[PDB]
């Protein structure tokens with residue numbers, strides 16, 4: 001079989017995942033299909049994880065039902081997986097304690113510059129020691145975290161695999177009465193949506209007790225540095241949760257109410273795509289055009305506000321680290337204290353460390369735990385039932401449809417004004433600090449130094465809001481513009497384009513792709529741009545001090561550019577395996593629950609369990625590879641992110657004779673913030689490039705085949721049509737079914753027809769309506785058919801379709817979408833349709849629209865509706881093709897004023913002493929005056 005190198009692996013290779021390099025060399029130029037992914041360990045099999053849990057659950061239910069109590073399943077889970085988390089808590093504690101020690105030893109290097117003496121070498125070795133203690137913490141947070149992460153991630157798949165085994169073992173025991181309650185849907189949902197929530201709980205289970213401790217420690221450390229002023233920064237940090245919950249509650253409403261306007265549009269588009277052969281023939285396009293335009297306009301108007309709310313939230317997240325500092329330090333200065341550089345950046349780091357993680361990870365954990373407990377309760381109640389006895393081109397085409405390039409220039413110039421202020425706000429504080437120390441009581445005026453600080457605080461927020469708003473608007477206008485082109489292009493396509501593409505594909509397109517364009521793209525773009533600009537500022541601040549740091553930057557910048565590729569070229573193949581191995585288990589389960597009686601007939605159910613386990617092991621292998629490959633890259637990245645910090649610190653120390661304390665503090669406080677932002681920036685690009693495929697495939701339309709125009713230059717002013725040796729063909733080079741369509745049907749001669757099945761009887765109607773322009777010409781009452789627009793031709797003809805169709809609407813719009821008749825004229829139209837009793841029995845009697853795809857009626861009255869359409873139209877030429885009968889027969893024989901009927905039917909006896917009759921050959925005709933000659 002396939003041995004996996006996870007075992008047979010020394011230490012120092014599991015920290016860096018050195019056992020995973022060969023695979024890449026193989027996936028670099030071969031596209032591994034299925035036989036190159038290793039098998040799982042012997043302690044991660046379903047048959048091994050689903051037995052101990054079953055035993056513990058049996059023991060627990062026994063101990064519970066023994067007494068007058070209620071049994072629980074959340075106790076049997078902790079009886080098995082308690083040592084694992086007990087051991088992981090040691091490391092999560094060791095890790096949460098290293099983020100509080102960095103700022104303590106950061107403030108000890110700056111104090112060496114505040115108290116500096118060249119002729120002193122005993123006070124410098126202590127500085128080197130302090131700096132050496134500051135690197136082990138980075139190496140702990142950067143290298144030893146990923147093994148722990150992989151383990152805490154693997155701790156969830158075990159539970160997810162243990163639950164499904166017992167769920168299936170139970171489902172194979174349901175009785176007749178018990179299975180009549182729950183059907184296939186719920187049983188497959190228990191595995192497709194519920195168990196899939198245990199993978200994220202273990203990641204967000206340690207914050208519940210690690211957030212408060214961190215906050216308390218941080219505030220206690222702050223008290224010893226500045227004093228009571230610290231409170232002024234912890235108040236602004238708690239108001240954010242109340243101020244952000246309400247706006248989310250408000251946003252959900254907007255979303256819910258726009259979903260309604262979306263669904264109706266989708267339904268209208270669906271019912272429009274099915275029946276094009278009738279709309280294109282009756283000339284009823286503008287109605288649906290307007291019906292879609294109105295709904296799209298409403299949807300956009302409702303989406304703008306939600307997008308604006310999201311942009312405001314992002315801006316708030318961008319500039320919340322400035323208000324806290326501003327408030328706390330203006331208070332600290334007004335109370336009467338003096339400002340130094342060893343107290344400022346320490347507090348900056350403490351804040352930046354606590355606020356983000358706590359306010360962004362404490363709320364999510366609660367939702368995760370709640371959902372997990374709900375799913376556990378569902379599973380518990382279920383387990384108790386009874387039992388038996390791309391490219392730059394796409395980006396350029398997606399951006400230039402939003403606004404003129406001057407707007408893009410303004411946007412580029414507006415995004416590089418927020419970061420400048422973000423950095424200048426701290427440079428000003430370092431400048432103040434350095435100006436304080438050069439005094440001898442020669443006090444500093446606070447008006448100037450405080451007003452400039454306030455102004456630099458205000459500009460940041462203003463620009464950060466403006467940027468987000470403009471970006472969102474520009475990226476929504478692009479979808480607004482593309483959807484139109486899409487619709488007004490697919491509406492003018494031939495019928496052949498629809499005979500090769502099923503409705504499902506086009507509907508899925510119109511729904512999913514536009515949803516992605518309108519919902520997610522702008523937010524991801526904005527977050528990616530923001531996090532990208534947040535890194536260039538760090539690097540530029542680190543270069544403007546110690547200019548020599550530009551030399552070791554060009555190599556670390558070239559390595560990454562390659563590494564990423566060397567990774568993706570095998571990472572774009574694991575998702576395919578995951579999906580292809582996850583679908584068959586669900587298929588097998590769904591098809592296995594129905595054929596159950598035979599499985600019970602023969603006492604053989606041990607094989608199906610083994611087959612299920614074998615099906616699940618493949619997905620287990622794929623998940624293992626996914627986790628390992630995701631962790632193989634972060635270590636390589638963090639190595640560089642930490643080498644940068646080491647270089648900065650030791651270079652600052654080696655050059656302690658040409659720079660001051662404020663500058664080194666500013667450079668160091670930013671270098672301790674690069675890892676997470678770089679990770680997020682590299683993570684967002686994946687999603688961006690993944691969802692840009694929707695944009696790539698949407699633009700595939702907007703340029704397709706296009707039939708002749710609807711209106712030519714020269715307008716037109718008994719239907720005597722004359723034919724010739726013309727020939728007709730569906731495709732330009734397909735087979736041929738009609739040859740030399742030669743015949744003449746002059747003034748109101750009631751033509752007939754007689755034909756067989758498949759010998760080309762339903763083709764001339766497609767040529768008369770020029771659904772596919774054939775070779776040759778056909779004269780009609782002094783004018784041709786190709787020298788006239790499509791609408792000027794398809795409007796002067798009436799057809800009785802074989803399959804009746806009624807659209808969602810009233811009996812007034814479905815029979816007269818264009819307002820040109822009066823009400824009494826419609827009543828007279830429906831006077832001779834033999835159907836006027838049903839209408840009046842309803843409230844409006846003509847305006848009570850119907851639903852359920854017209855299921856309220858049947859073929860009979862629907863064909864009556866079609867005949868009513870034909871009558872109300874009052875045209876000269878008429879083409880009837882049918883394949884109640886007495887009603888239609890007699891009434892059409894009576895009403896129509898003997899105007900050039902063309903009847904087509906499969907029953908020859910439908911003719912009763914007609915005027916002129918024909919037969920069908922395989923493409924030609926055998927006819928003369930009347931059939932009595934031969935017959």
Ligand SMILES: Nc1ncnc2c1ncn2[C@@H]1O[C@@H]2COP(=O)(O)O[C@H]2[C@H]1O
Nearest residue numbers: 356357360673674675676677678679680
């Ligand atoms: N909404 C978010 N979800 C996850 N990670 C984020 C988010 N926003 C920013 N990040 C980054 O992800 C990092 C995860 O670890 P840190 O808390 O050290 O710092 C975090 C940020 O750099």
